[PDB]
From Swiss-Prot:
<dbReference type="GO" id="GO:1900121">
    <property type="term" value="P:negative regulation of receptor binding"/>
</dbReference>
<dbReference type="GO" id="GO:0023026">
    <property type="term" value="F:MHC class II protein complex binding"/>
</dbReference>
<dbReference type="GO" id="GO:0007608">
    <property type="term" value="P:sensory perception of smell"/>
</dbReference>
<dbReference type="GO" id="GO:0042803">
    <property type="term" value="F:protein homodimerization activity"/>
</dbReference>
<dbReference type="GO" id="GO:0002503">
    <property type="term" value="P:peptide antigen assembly with MHC class II protein complex"/>
</dbReference>
<dbReference type="GO" id="GO:0001913">
    <property type="term" value="P:T cell mediated cytotoxicity"/>
</dbReference>
<keyword id="KW-0873">Pyrrolidone carboxylic acid</keyword>
<dbReference type="GO" id="GO:0010977">
    <property type="term" value="P:negative regulation of neuron projection development"/>
</dbReference>
<dbReference type="GO" id="GO:0000139">
    <property type="term" value="C:Golgi membrane"/>
</dbReference>
<keyword id="KW-0732">Signal</keyword>
<dbReference type="GO" id="GO:0005783">
    <property type="term" value="C:endoplasmic reticulum"/>
</dbReference>
<dbReference type="GO" id="GO:0005794">
    <property type="term" value="C:Golgi apparatus"/>
</dbReference>
<dbReference type="GO" id="GO:0001916">
    <property type="term" value="P:positive regulation of T cell mediated cytotoxicity"/>
</dbReference>
<dbReference type="GO" id="GO:0005198">
    <property type="term" value="F:structural molecule activity"/>
</dbReference>
<dbReference type="GO" id="GO:0071316">
    <property type="term" value="P:cellular response to nicotine"/>
</dbReference>
<dbReference type="GO" id="GO:0042824">
    <property type="term" value="C:MHC class I peptide loading complex"/>
</dbReference>
<dbReference type="GO" id="GO:0035580">
    <property type="term" value="C:specific granule lumen"/>
</dbReference>
């Protein structure tokens, strides 16, 4: 049996500018088994208009890229939440502007 913790990067396509359109990305990789939950949150609310890659597998583990087009503002908070068996509790990774 193999258990591997998701590695998570949360990043915008470009440096943020309030009122300027951009992409927000949550890349989750290196995990096993494939059981996982991934959501993007804006101000504590699941983001509805999201795209992602088809769940896939690399001998060196599982990976998903999950993203959305967005326009940030001064006060909006974004995060990617990941749950996986290797985590003691679901992990919230904030977008650091
Ligand atoms: C599958 C896989 C493995 C590693 C991996 C990714 C995907 S995506 C990533 C990444 C690296 C640098 C940055 N910025 C400088 C914004 C954003 C994301 N890494 C390091
Ligand atoms: C985790 C979490 C939960 C709730 C939550 C946030 C983060 S951030 C937020 C907020 C409230 C007001 C504004 N403006 C007036 C621009 C922008 C963001 N709420 C309401
Ligand atoms: Hg899905």
């Amino acid at each position: 049996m193999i258990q591997r913790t998701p590695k998570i990067q949360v990043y915008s396509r470009f440096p943020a500018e309030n009122g300027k359109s951009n992409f927000l990305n949550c890349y989750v990789s290196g995990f096993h088994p494939s059981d996982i939950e991934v959501d993007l949150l804006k101000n504590g609310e699941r983001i509805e208009k999201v795209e992602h890659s088809d769940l896939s597998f690399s001998k060196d583990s599982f990976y998903l890229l999950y993203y959305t087009e967005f326009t940030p503002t001064e006060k909006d908070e974004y995060a990617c939440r990941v749950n996986h068996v290797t985590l003691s509790q679901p992990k919230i990774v904030k977008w650091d502007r």
